[PDB]
């Protein structure tokens, strides 16, 4: 019965590790893209010298 | 030379608008992945996904 409880409730660690690495990479890319978007705004100053 | 109209400036404005739209699309695409990210993309592939 506790083996069945484990089968219903336990999770494989390898897939979670892969997801953690993927989400860390996605967070890094999202942060870089957000920084680029923020830096995009101030380019308009060249028109107004 | 007319001080009331500027054809070169208007063409540059249209070019800037096109570049801004393309940059926004690519920035969202790189932020969230998802080459087909919304229904505004290829509708059939979005529905299949």
Number of helices of chain A: 2
> Multimeric state of these chains?
part of a larger assembly
Give the overall form of chain A: rod-shaped
Q: Could you describe the largest sheet of chain A, including whether it forms a barrel?
A: none
Protein name (chain B): Flagellin A
Subcellular location (chain B): Secreted; Bacterial flagellum
Family (chain B): Belongs to the bacterial flagellin family.
Function (chain B): Flagellin is the subunit protein which polymerizes to form the filaments of bacterial flagella. Homomer of FlaA is able to form a functional filament.
Folded structure, characterized:
- This is part of a larger assembly, with two copies of chain A (49 residues).
- Chain A is mainly alpha-helical.
- Chain A is 73% helix and 0% strand.
- Chain A has helices at residues 2-9, 13-40.
- The longest helix of chain A is centred in the middle third of the chain and has 28 residues, at 13-40.
- The termini of chain A are far apart.
Keywords, please?
part of a larger assembly, 2 chains, 49 residues, mainly alpha, 2 helices, 0% strand, Flagellin A (chain B)
Topology:
The structure is cut from a larger assembly and holds two copies of chain A (49 residues).
Chain A: H1 2-9, H2 13-40
